[PDB]
Amino acid sequence: GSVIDPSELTFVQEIGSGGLVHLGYWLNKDKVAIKTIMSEEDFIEEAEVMMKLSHPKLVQLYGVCLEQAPICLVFEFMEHGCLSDYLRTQRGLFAAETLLGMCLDVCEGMAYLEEACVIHRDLAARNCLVGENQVIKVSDFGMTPVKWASPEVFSFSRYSSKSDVWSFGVLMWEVFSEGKIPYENRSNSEVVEDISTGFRLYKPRLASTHVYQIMNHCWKERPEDRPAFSRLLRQLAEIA
């Protein structure tokens, strides 16, 4: 399943930690994001799933480097790193249209995963990447915090594409607030209690009445009342 020899990789600079990430080169040519190692088998399987899902708004892999421990996944290099950090560093420089376009990119990737019956389970701005011309790609979509979890997920672990829709609503909030922490300084028990009473994340300044309505549609108590990613995509496109 696309095996890369360790000698083919050149480690240049550490760029992140989660799962350690390095900026590097494969075959002294392509810029790569090397993600060094959860069990070894699950780490390989996540890449195998991702390598068979081709969409312009989903991150791509060059291959997997096994044989020598710690094992690593060889991803394409994304120029502007993770979406969460990009929003925080470029805060105050974003236009409303740019933020909506970011949500539309994520929604496109999510609509593809929804049709392929692939549940992300951890959709958040920290799991999204920024490339050339501010193109957003969904990352870590091959897996098998409660702040992004739907009520049926944090209470009954009922994962579905509709639970990813709730997570997308929180992602939409992260984007429009320019990288703000959802339910800041609040514990896991506190967020569960708030959401159960009917509390929802506040409307950020850059998000219009229509954008906030879409966020609240993603945040409906019952998963059946939430719109599918295929529907959400056209709703977001209509606001633009």
Ligand SMILES: CCC(O)(CC)c1ccc2c(-c3ccc(OC)cc3)c(-c3n[nH]c4ccsc34)[nH]c2c1
């Ligand atoms: C914006 C500053 C800079 O340009 C500095 C070289 C940069 C910084 C971080 C990244 C990452 C990246 C590294 C670790 C991350 O945490 C998982 C998320 C993103 C990535 C990245 N690109 N592609 C992939 C795949 C998994 S993480 C990652 N590119 C980065 C680029």
